[PDB]
Amino acid sequence: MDEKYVNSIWDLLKNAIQEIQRKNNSGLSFEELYRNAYTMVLHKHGEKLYTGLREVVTEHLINKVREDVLNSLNNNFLQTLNQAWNDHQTAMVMIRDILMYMDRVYVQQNNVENVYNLGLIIFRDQVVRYGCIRDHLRQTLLDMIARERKGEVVDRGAIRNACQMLMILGLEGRSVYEEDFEAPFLEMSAEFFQMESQKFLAENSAS
Amino acid sequence: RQINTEYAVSLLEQLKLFYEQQLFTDIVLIVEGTEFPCHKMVLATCSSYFRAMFMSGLSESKQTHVHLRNVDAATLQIIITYAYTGNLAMNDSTVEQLYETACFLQVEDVLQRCREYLIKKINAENCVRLLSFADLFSCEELKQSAKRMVEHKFTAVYHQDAFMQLSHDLLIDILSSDNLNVEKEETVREAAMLWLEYNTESRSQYLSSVLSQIRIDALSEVTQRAWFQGLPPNDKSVVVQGLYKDMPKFFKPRLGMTKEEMMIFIEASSENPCSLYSSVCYSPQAEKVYKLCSPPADLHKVGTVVTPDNDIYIAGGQVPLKFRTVNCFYWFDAQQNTWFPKTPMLFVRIKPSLVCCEGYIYAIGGDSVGGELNRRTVERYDTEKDEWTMVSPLPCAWQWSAAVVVHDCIYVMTLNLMYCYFPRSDSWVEMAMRQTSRSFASAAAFGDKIFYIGGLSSVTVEIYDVNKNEWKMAANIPAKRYSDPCVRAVVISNSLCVFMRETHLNERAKYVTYQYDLELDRWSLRQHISERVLWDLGRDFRCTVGKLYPSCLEESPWKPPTYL
Amino acid sequence: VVKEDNIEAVGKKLHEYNTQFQEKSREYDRLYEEYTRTSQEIQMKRTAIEAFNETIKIFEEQCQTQERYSKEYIEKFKREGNEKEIQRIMHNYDKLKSRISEIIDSRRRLEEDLKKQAAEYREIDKRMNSIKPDLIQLRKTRDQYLMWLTQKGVRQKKLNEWLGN
C-alpha cells in the first residue's frame, strides 16, 4: 500500500535476485520472494517491477562482460563464453520461475516480451552484439573452421554450442544467425572453394 | 497405443485414497496456523506456482514446511480438492475469494472455470462490484462483460455504494463510453456529481477530468424540440439513426438516448427459404423492419416476455431432435444483438405464458409433463438469485391460455373462466367468468382494464375491470367480411392497439394497426403497415412491445419494392 | 427466323430470344431495386443534412447566447481575478468553435458522399434510359414471333421449359 513498503519489497527482491546471480541461491527463504512479487504486481505496480528488473540484470551484464572482454576474451574464449551462457540461462530460468505471474498478467498487457525473451534479447545485444567481442568471436570461428578444413582437429563441442546458442538468440529461428555468422561464413567458404578449385584444376586430371 | 482412461480414473482415486490417509506426505503447507500436508508432485501438476517453487530446489523446496501468506485456508482446501478430484465448488458466496487464491497460485483450470462462472453471474447488483474486481486482477474477459452490463443499466446501478468507491480509471471509461443507457444527459451529470462529493479530499484534483467526460454542449434531442417536430410522420427516428451515425464521439447522443419502441415479432416467417421461425421487429415511427439474430439455434414454439424494465426473455420451446422439448432460457442483449443464456428452467416447456410481476418472471403452462403427477405446471424465477422455484399450480389444466399482469397481480385466462394469483398469498382465486368461450386469443393489459381480444377467431373484444370484476362487451374489430384476420393485442404509446394481419380470398397478407377509443368505445385507424416492408409472418408468430436500439441492431433492406 | 423450313431451327431461335428476354427482366427488376434503394438512400441522407443544418443553426444560437452571457451574468465572474469559474462558458466556447469546424468538415464529407453516390447512381440511370427501348423492342419482336412460330407445333409446356432455363 504505502510507497515505502513497495520500495522495501523491491529492495528485498533486488537483493534476492542479486544473490541468485551469484550462484548461491541455496539456503535462502525465497518463498516470501514470490508472495512479494504477487503483492507488488497486484497493486498494479508491474511497470516498475519489470523496468527495475531489466535495469538490474542489464547492469549485472555490463559488469560481467566488461570483465570478460578485459580477461576471458583471451584465456579459453569459447569455453568461458558457453560457461557464462549456460550460467545466465539457468539464472534467467530461475527468475522466470520466480516472476511467472508477471509473465502471465503484465506481459500480455503492454505487448512487451516476457522476462525470458527480455533476458535473451539483452544478452544477445549487450553481451554478444557488442563491438570488441563480435569481431573476436567471428575471427575465432573462422580460424577454427579453416584449420578444420585443412586437417587440424578442433573440439566440435565448442563450435556446436556456439552455433546452437546463436540460433537460440534469434527467438524467431536462425534470424541473427544469418547476419552474425552465416554472412561471413558464406563468403569465406566461397573464396576457399575458389582457391581450392584453382589449385586443383591446374595440375590434376578430371578422373 | 496411447493413454488409457480406465487406468487414469483408477490412478486418480488411488491417489485420493492415499491423500485422505496421509501417505507419502513430503511437504506441509502452513497457512494462518493451519497445516495442510500434501504432495509436491500433485500441486505442481495443478498449479504452476508450486511447479516454479519446487523445480527451483532451493531452501523453500528443501524445507518440508512452507509458509504461504495471503492465502485463505478455505480456498486452499478447495484448490487441493480439485488437484485430487477435478471437481470445483463454485458458489456465489466464495467465488470472488477463490479467484483471488487461484490467480495467486496460477491454476489454469480453476481460473478458466471461475472466469466463465462469474461471466454468467453478473446481474443488476454485483455488476459494479465485479467490474472493480476484474480491473484489480486484470481479467480482460470479465472486465468487458461487466462493463457492458453497467452500460445497459447505468440509470439503475449508479445509486449503489460500489459505484462511488470506483477508481478514477474505472470512471473515465464508463462516462466516455457512448453505451450509457440514459434517457437524459442530466442523469449522467448527477451521477458524476455524486461521485466527486463522496470523497472530496481525494477527488478534488480530478474535478477537471470529470467535467471533461460528461457531454454538456451535446444537445442531443433538445434541439429537435426547439425548432419543431415538422417532419414526415414520426420521423424523429430517422434523425436518431443519422446524428449518432456521424459525430465526433464527444457530442454523440448516448445509447440510451437512442431508443425506439418496436413491435418485436419472434418465430415469424422468412422472406427467403431459411429459418422457418425467424425474428424481426418493425418500428411504426421509422417505418423500418430490423432483423434480429437467433442464437437459440432453431428454437421452435417458444414464449415471449417483456418486463416493465424493458428486459426481454424467452423460455421453453422445442429444438429439432437430432423435435424435443427443452428448458432453455435466453436473455436478449440490446447492444450486442445476441441471446445470452441464463439459468435453465426446472421443467421443459413449450410456449409458456411468461409474465413479469413485482420483478419475478413466471412460467405458466408450457408443455405439461407427467399428466399423472401434474399438468398445470408453473414456476417462478428470481433475477438476482438466478434460481427457479415451484409455486401454486393452476387450479385446472388448460391449453392455449394467456397470462397478463395488472397492478402486481397475475391473471390467467382460459376458455370461459379466469383465475387471479396473488404472490402475497400464493393461491388462486376464481374471478368473473367470460361470457364467450374462445381459444387461441390474444391478451393485453392497459390501465385498469384487461383486454381478452380474438379467439374462437372473431372480432369480439372483451373489456374486464379489476376494480369491478365484470366482463362486458364493448365493440367489434372493424374488418372486411369473409377475411381471416389473425389479430394480436399490443399496447404502445400508452394506448391499446391491435396488430391485425388480414388475409382475404386470393389476396396476399395485409398488415394494419388500429387504435381503440377508450372514452368513445370506438376503433380509429392509426397507421397502415406499408406492404413494401413487413413481408408475410404467418399466424403462429409471437408478438410483444419493447424498445430496442435503432442505433444498433441489424440493417436488412431486402423486401424487393415496386413490384408488379 | 429467316423462314427456316426446318421448324426445329426456328424453335431454337425462339429459345435464344427466350434467354435474351429473361436476362433483361432480371436486370430490369434489379435496376428497379437499385432505383428504390437509391431513393431511400438520398431520403435518409437529406433528413441527415437538414438535421446537420438545424444543429448548426442552434449552435450559432448558442454562439450568440455566449455574447448574451457576456452582458447578462459575466459581471460577477471576470473582475474577481478567477479563471476556473468562467470555464462554464469560456472553456465551453473554444471547444464549441472546434465542434463547429469539425461538423463543417462532416457536412463536407456528407456532401462528397452525396455527389459520389449521385454519380454512381446516374452512371447506371443512363443505362436504364438506354436498356428500356431495347427491352421493349425485344419484347415486341417476341410478341410478333409468338403470333407466327408458336402456332406451328410447339407446346405451351415447351415454351415454359425454354423460358425456365
Side-chain angles (χ1 to χ4, degrees), chain A residues 44 94, chain B residues 52 106 135-136:
Chain A
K44 293 122 206 243
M94 198 64 60
Chain B
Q106 298 84 32
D135 188 19
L136 183 60

Side-chain angles (χ1 to χ4, degrees), chain B residues 109-214 216-224 226-388:
Chain B
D109 299 1
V110 175
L111 280 176
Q112 184 65 25
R113 294 188 178 184
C114 294
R115 181 180 300 180
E116 57 87 16
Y117 179 81
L118 286 175
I119 273 155
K120 63 207 206 232
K121 263 343 127 226
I122 318 184
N123 38 75
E125 229 64 57
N126 59 358
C127 28
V128 216
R129 184 173 61 92
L130 290 180
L131 181 58
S132 60
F133 182 86
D135 188 19
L136 183 60
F137 294 89
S138 68
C139 184
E140 71 286 346
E141 299 295 78
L142 182 60
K143 180 180 180 180
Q144 292 292 340
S145 181
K147 180 180 179 180
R148 297 172 181 179
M149 182 60 60
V150 176
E151 301 304 271
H152 179 61
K153 301 178 181 180
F154 179 81
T155 180
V157 306
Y158 79 102
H159 291 290
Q160 301 179 0
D161 57 77
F163 186 82
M164 287 79 72
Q165 66 178 0
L166 295 179
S167 179
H168 181 266
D169 54 356
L170 287 177
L171 180 69
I172 60 180
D173 63 330
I174 292 183
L175 301 182
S176 60
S177 179
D178 56 76
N179 303 328
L180 288 177
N181 180 22
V182 287
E183 305 294 335
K184 295 181 180 180
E185 58 88 14
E186 290 78 1
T187 58
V188 184
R189 184 190 65 177
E190 299 295 334
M193 294 301 105
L194 54 87
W195 182 91
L196 49 85
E197 59 93 274
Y198 177 80
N199 196 330
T200 60
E201 55 86 17
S202 65
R203 300 173 177 180
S204 59
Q205 60 179 0
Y206 300 150
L207 84 171
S208 60
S209 59
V210 169
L211 52 85
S212 62
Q213 304 297 335
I214 170 64
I216 173 65
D217 298 359
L219 283 75
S220 300
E221 305 289 68
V222 304
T223 60
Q224 303 186 208
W227 165 39
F228 205 70
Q229 206 181 355
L231 272 181
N234 204 326
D235 269 23
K236 288 188 118 38
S237 12
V238 196
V239 198
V240 168
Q241 41 206 294
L243 240 54
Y244 192 46
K245 277 344 126 75
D246 172 56
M247 246 177 173
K249 287 192 173 183
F250 185 83
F251 307 88
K252 272 191 177 303
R254 306 192 181 277
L255 199 51
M257 331 278 184
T258 71
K259 286 302 286 209
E260 294 184 0
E261 307 180 359
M262 304 177 184
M263 299 181 180
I264 307 176
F265 304 103
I266 308 186
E267 289 186 341
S269 122
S270 178
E271 16 185 344
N272 87 106
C274 245
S275 44
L276 51 119
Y277 268 172
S278 59
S279 302
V280 288
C281 58
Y282 168 76
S283 170
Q285 339 129 344
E287 288 108 13
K288 274 161 216 136
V289 168
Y290 302 79
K291 183 179 180 180
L292 306 178
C293 182
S294 182
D298 302 330
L299 240 314
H300 309 302
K301 305 286 293 300
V302 310
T304 64
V305 56
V306 168
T307 70
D309 301 332
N310 202 90
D311 304 333
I312 312 172
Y313 302 96
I314 54 179
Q318 61 179 4
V319 296
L321 198 155
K322 182 60 77 281
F323 40 87
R324 59 163 59 91
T325 308
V326 298
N327 60 330
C328 61
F329 187 86
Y330 302 98
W331 169 52
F332 177 82
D333 195 348
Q335 184 174 15
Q336 300 177 22
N337 200 351
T338 74
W339 267 104
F340 310 131
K342 329 272 130 239
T343 291
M345 306 179 302
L346 302 179
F347 298 90
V348 302
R349 292 180 182 267
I350 287 181
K351 282 183 173 180
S353 354
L354 296 154
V355 285
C356 178
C357 178
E358 302 179 0
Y360 296 88
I361 303 178
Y362 303 84
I364 310 179
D367 191 69
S368 151
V369 178
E372 181 69 22
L373 205 283
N374 61 330
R375 312 191 75 261
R376 348 91 184 268
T377 305
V378 61
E379 56 189 358
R380 67 174 182 178
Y381 168 82
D382 197 294
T383 47
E384 305 308 290
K385 277 185 231 130
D386 311 283
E387 248 107 61
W388 288 91

